[PDB]
Design a binder for this molecule. Structure first.
Ligand SMILES: Cc1cc(S(=O)(=O)Nc2ccc3c(c2)CN(C)C(=O)N3)ccc1F
Length: 127
């Protein structure tokens, strides 16, 4: 039958990780600002291709990422540096633009969240 893939890991004892003021800002300011946006909801958890009737999603998107995963990674101090976390946000946005049709509602939502994201990481503290 239909199935979702296992979600991205939010812990890995053998991964190198650190706490930095930039990673604290990425949770406290960036993630928590985007999370409260009226367009956040499709991005707050891994895509449930079964319940959302998107059977092609994991045929097209092979590096899934979502803000639920990013939130848990930040809370778990999973990252080595801010760049690793920013890369996860960028993967999430890129996947949306690859999978969905330009001008569709999901793309308008991603565009609005990405506009905010780009503003917020411009005020990333110097480490
Ligand atoms: C805004 C919106 C959402 C949904 S849905 O949430 O019910 N299904 C859904 C439909 C498409 C997507 C996603 C969810 C999530 N996602 C990250 C993505 O890239 N595409 C369907 C139509 C639609 F216009």
């Amino acid at each position: 039958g239909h199935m979702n893939p296992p979600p991205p890991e939010t812990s890995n004892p053998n991964k190198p990780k650190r706490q930095t003021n930039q990673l604290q800002y990425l949770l406290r300011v960036v993630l928590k600002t985007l999370w409260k946006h009226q367009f956040a909801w499709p991005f707050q958890q891994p895509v449930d291709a079964v319940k959302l009737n998107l059977p092609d999603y994991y045929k097209i998107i092979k590096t899934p990422m979502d803000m639920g995963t990013i939130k848990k990674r930040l809370e778990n101090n999973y990252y080595w540096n801010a760049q690793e976390c920013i890369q996860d946000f960028n993967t999430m946005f890129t996947n949306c633009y690859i999978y969905n049709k330009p001008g569709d509602d999901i793309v308008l939502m991603a565009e609005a969240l990405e506009k905010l994201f780009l503003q917020k990481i411009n005020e990333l503290p110097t480490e």
